[PDB]
């Protein structure tokens, strides 16, 4: 017997209560999987549910009382949790799950199956996700003016596009993206688009997290990064002027991997699982504070090179090497997107984008040759190789040119590799980073008198 | 009679609820020993444990309040104390304990036994837990892409080998072993594999444990590593930028010990049972504040040599030095890996290397030659040796060598030693150490005090 043991077995026999790997129930209500850390919604789950049950059980669940012994009934029948959020192609709304790959939109019982515990937060709308409308024209036109369709801004818009459909994936992804322009570019009008376009999945931080340790203490700003499939970070402090800290460069290694680690306030949970998009909005290039190919092989960079300006500024404007173009400014295109005008609009092309560039694989790839600071590094793997086994018979002509062999490897010693690449750079500018890779690759091979285990691809190239 | 009593006693005579030594309550259920301390589950048992019981005893478990008092009970019989994960050489995993001595899979009454209170976290699958396998022929590719099975990496690849095996045992390890390399060749791919094959016995924590002091207050990131079978703190933060605390040689020695000292958020348990083997990967060699033979017993390094690239950048790959062999990356891996698709297959590996290299006793043993820091102290304790009496009848020719002579003890002054070292080392990089060594070695004799006891091996072979 016993009523209530029943009904919650009859409950629980739909799977609409799942237990998590994190210690939180999850509850299938209003065609969404919804939880809460501090008021859990079995009760809510309960209440709801009761219209699917027999006519002598749906009358007992009236009484608030009765649905508290059927959640503890519950609680106790949940002995082995599950795992969450395992589709990187799915992209859940409030009321279903829409497939990215398909274009087919799920509900109920279909869109059950993807345990997705995040969502946008509204509802999708078939009828205002539409290829033609005239919300769509203006936006096309908007995204147009921003990102030109010329053959010298090809790279460059696919690139955009490409980061902006990554924003749809549940996945990890590889790069962090700098959104890069002067002021009055269309920059935080397409952080503003985005962030109507994908909703509760879109998240705001700070500089701390590129600047400072992530471990210390408890750090909100990381913890709050949880499932996320696009976090921004805007405004670089130029480190031009001084007492700016640096971007440390372990902390873009740790921002790639597919966990980071920390710690919110009153809590012991200490890793997070990263699905998201990094974008700084900036005016300022980056500097860090150590350059290795590492951190080269994770940044990526996107110009923004259209000015919007009223009239008076218009011909002051038309005059800056900074700006490709000049356009005339909106005065109501600001609260229009607050209004959600381009919401399905910019959805549809996100998917659009999303099946153009998402072939079998999709990744994310750096562009090293935008940042000013890679410059030495990129040129010095240019003019130098390492000295291997196969240049050792060679070594006449290299000994004319001033090559020594030491424990049969050919080298070159201090002051003549130091003149030989101040012929190639300026001792002027390019002075301390110079001594740090001298510094950095010197080896002591006999007793003092060290060398560089290097060689100039000119000397070999022209005997 | 009082059937609830009852029931509570018959349930305490299985021997299914026990109490721990850190004052917490293990129950068994479904093949294993869960906890959890915000939670109990008692109740989750009482209802679990109910058709073992008389029929007339069955149908009174049915109700949340009975089973509250039946807890009541139980919670009052409990009275004294007992210990958990003892034995070393056993696996546990969600539905039973695998035996690593001799293969055997016990689930049940015959896993009972063994007091495991962690797990992997996932059930054993006897079929794919095999020798032939496409996973397994895919899995030894990788591994041998990675680790090169060539001569002249023999041993680095047997110490690979043995310190992933490690992974498996519930001992404390006295070893801290660094994964180091370059870009792009595999260390982030062998720390998923290895957690993807061990589950639940991975953390992965921060650099704060190796860099910070470990008491301080509360530090979930040192609490957390309890009962642990691996920890994983990674991306050393380049310490030679010298914008950062240097590694901590007390950190170092507190960490292989088989207890740590270290408090989480509230709780009152404040030491940790030390199971885990630390493994750190990184781009950079390892710095520590201070040098000795202490510090030199406990650290080993696993090298990584093989470059994935693309084919743009394959050239410049196979012209560094850093590299020994340069091959194709593939894109589809860390998806694979992702997806747990080589799970058990990585598991047989570990135990067949666990059998290989698990001669009665398996230990860990150090590497300090592959530390370049080291050098000095190192090729210090094949120059010198301290002097001692049977170097006493050399006086006439030590002093024709330059040695004075200071009640019955050979001693060499401080001009004459350094002028004497001079010879075997340079001046502007060794000059910090030698005087780091006169100072700490820094005796007293000759003018007042300020002079060496020690014999240069070659005036001891030199008559
Ligand atoms: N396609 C467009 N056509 C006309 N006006 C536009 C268009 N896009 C943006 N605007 C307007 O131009 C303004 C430029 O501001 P904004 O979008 O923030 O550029 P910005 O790069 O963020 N400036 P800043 O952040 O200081 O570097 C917007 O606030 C709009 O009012
Ligand atoms: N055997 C293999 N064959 C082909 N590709 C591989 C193989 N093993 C790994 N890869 C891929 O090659 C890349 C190497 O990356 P990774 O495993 O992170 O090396 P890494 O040393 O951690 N890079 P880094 O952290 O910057 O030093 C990844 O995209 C892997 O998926
Ligand atoms: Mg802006
Ligand atoms: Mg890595």
Redesign the interface.
Known sequence: ??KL?NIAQRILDTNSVLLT?R?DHIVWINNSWKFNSEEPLITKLILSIRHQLPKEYSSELLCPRKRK?VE??IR??L??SVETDTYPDKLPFKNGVLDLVDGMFYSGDDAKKYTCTVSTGFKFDDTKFVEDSPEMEELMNIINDIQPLTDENKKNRELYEKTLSSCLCG??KGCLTFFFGETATGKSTTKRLLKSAIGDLFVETGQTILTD????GPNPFIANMHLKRSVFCSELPDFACSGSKKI???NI??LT???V?G?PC???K??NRNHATIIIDTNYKPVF??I???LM?RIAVVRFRTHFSQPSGREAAENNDAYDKVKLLDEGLDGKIQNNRYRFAFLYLLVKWYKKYHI??M?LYPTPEEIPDFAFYLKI?TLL????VKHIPLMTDLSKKGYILYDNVVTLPLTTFQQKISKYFNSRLFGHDIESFINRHKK?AN??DEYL?YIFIEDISSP
């Open positions: 017997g016993n043991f790997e210690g012994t503890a009934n106790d029948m002995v082995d996945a990890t340790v992530l471990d210390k440390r460069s372990d290694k740790k991997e597919p966990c680690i710690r009153f809590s012991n200490i890793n504070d150590r290795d190919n590492a092989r079998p694989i990744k793997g190789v390492s000295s291997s002591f007793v003092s285990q």
